[PDB]
Amino acid sequence: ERMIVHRCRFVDFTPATITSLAFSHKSNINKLTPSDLRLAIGRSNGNIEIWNPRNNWFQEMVIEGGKDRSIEGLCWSNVNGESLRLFSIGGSTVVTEWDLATGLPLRNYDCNSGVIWSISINDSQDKLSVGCDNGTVVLIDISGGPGVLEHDTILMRQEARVLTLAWKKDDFVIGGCSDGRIRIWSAQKNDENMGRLLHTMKVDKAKKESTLVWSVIYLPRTDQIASGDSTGSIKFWDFQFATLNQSFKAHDADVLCLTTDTDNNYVFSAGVDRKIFQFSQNTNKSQKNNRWVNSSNRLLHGNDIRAICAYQSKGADFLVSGGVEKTLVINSLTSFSNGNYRKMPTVEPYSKNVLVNKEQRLVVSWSESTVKIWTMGNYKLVCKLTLKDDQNISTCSLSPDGQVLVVGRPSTTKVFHLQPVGNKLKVTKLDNDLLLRTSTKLVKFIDNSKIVICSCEDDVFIVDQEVELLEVTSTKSSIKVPYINRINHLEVDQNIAVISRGCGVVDILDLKARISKPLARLNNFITAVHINTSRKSVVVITADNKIYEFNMNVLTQWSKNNTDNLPKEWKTLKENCVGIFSDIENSSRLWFWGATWISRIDFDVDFPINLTITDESNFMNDHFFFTDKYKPLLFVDLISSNELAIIERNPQKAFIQPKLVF
């Protein structure tokens, strides 16, 4: 037969709105991009993705939160010589610091006053401001080491809630509040006026509603505070004399987030009216007169912009923005109006939420804390498990023959026997307290009974017991970004597995002797791994979009000519291939897929010859077929020797900025 294709649009797995973008390292234009730069994206359903902007923005890790959890602000902290530290507020009274290894909170510091509305990090990163609902600004001593947080000082109180914070330096702390005012406190310890609010400024109020100052930044090249409020106006204030220099009436509704570049020649700003405005001071006359101009204005987002940030280095100068529509947008910093931009896909499934089983023609898919199963026929939803004893979900696998499902999150996992009772299923928990106590990242089913478990604390069990696993050399990037030496992937069928950690290490393991035989042999982050039983091979693909294969018991000649005979589609690819499998009718052809395309490479053929992180910066160290007509893509797989399963996505009020009518 020819390939018959099930273009499924059943799964309505929808992410949530980006509420906070942050960059791990600050800008430093005249030095190279550090190998430890990570962008962090906190959504509104409570999960924190961490992306690396090397070679078109791959996604390294994801830290999910559970039911009724959100995340409103998040800040990085990297004292030079120590590990990265990631703090985040939710809609609650605590700050939550996460250890990047496990993907769990390692500290929930309850701030001692009210519900936190904003968070900011000191310059030199030893103190932390949390601005709370009862008008307080609380200082948290951060420099005690990673994990230990102390209370320092509650600054002088006020009535209205402080909605945004910024620091001048180690010295002063600026805060925009919900009464339309902008206070300036002094956090300079061992002064006479420590903690008391030195100044108050009032923005031009709205006529028929209350005004809220939503975004405040400090501009260090000049000595100003930029501030966006809920009238749309953007004001620049001289810090000394605490007074306005110039006001622009830029947006039509609120200005939720605004940011600046390194040398403060530009200020970018955005809000609910979904345009991004650029205010420039680049002319020598502008710099000697201290006069910003409203330079430009772009309409790129669909609904809102709730978060904006900027990075600028020797081989990277981009501002990143995201909002109520769930996608990310990258623009250039010094070439905003002129240059190009890239709207990311709303999901790039580096961690999958859908898998199928060929027997019973069935497919399982898990959104937040519920799984669902349907069969092909049309299609019919046969069962679902809205387990609400759970709070957060993570990865899942089904037994071949479709008997037992296992769902698993970083706190526990749970296994359910299934029996098809006709037009429905019957699902029963089968108790195992070892599974109920273990942390699981990946479960991948050696047999109908045996599974292999990768724990969040780097343990590899075999249940239904222990694989010896050698240690990795801890270099500076491994001590800086503390999840690089963590097992991302493991793929197995028939007693032979292979694990993969993102330092460029991909290690096989025989399930019998439980010995490594390492084949690290790599240069950067590994996107996907699939084992070919034909050729006795492992197939790794890295973030640079190269396909390597190696043998087992280094790379084959097919790899050796394929890598540099690779097609132009792969050489101009933008979305990384997150899934590989092999064809079912032929044991040697392999069939892979990214988030916007589907390809298939042939095992023997070779074809003839004749807005990124682009610098000389290193990685994290110091017949051929191609289609894209199923581009909003979530997951693909096979069922039998002729058909294919292509499950994708399909689609909210927004500020109407109308197209010209004719």
Binding site: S337, N338, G339
Partner: protein, 59 residues
């Protein structure tokens, strides 16, 4: 100026700008006329955006 498309003179009459058509496209040149205080020139592709080259000729 050996090919002129468009021209304007400042309000005081102290300097004047004009267009050139000298190759891939036109060009823009400003010159003070009552003194050699300033005379500059540049191709107007550095004025124009990157969006306009894939848009209509009105842009």
């Amino acid at each position: 100026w050996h090919n002129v498309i468009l021209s304007n003179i400042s309000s005081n009459g102290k300097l004047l700008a004009h267009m050139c058509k000298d190759v891939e496209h036109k060009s823009i040149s400003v010159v003070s006329l009552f003194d050699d205080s300033v005379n500059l020139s540049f191709p107007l592709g550095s004025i124009l955006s990157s969006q306009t080259q894939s848009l209509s000729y009105n842009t």
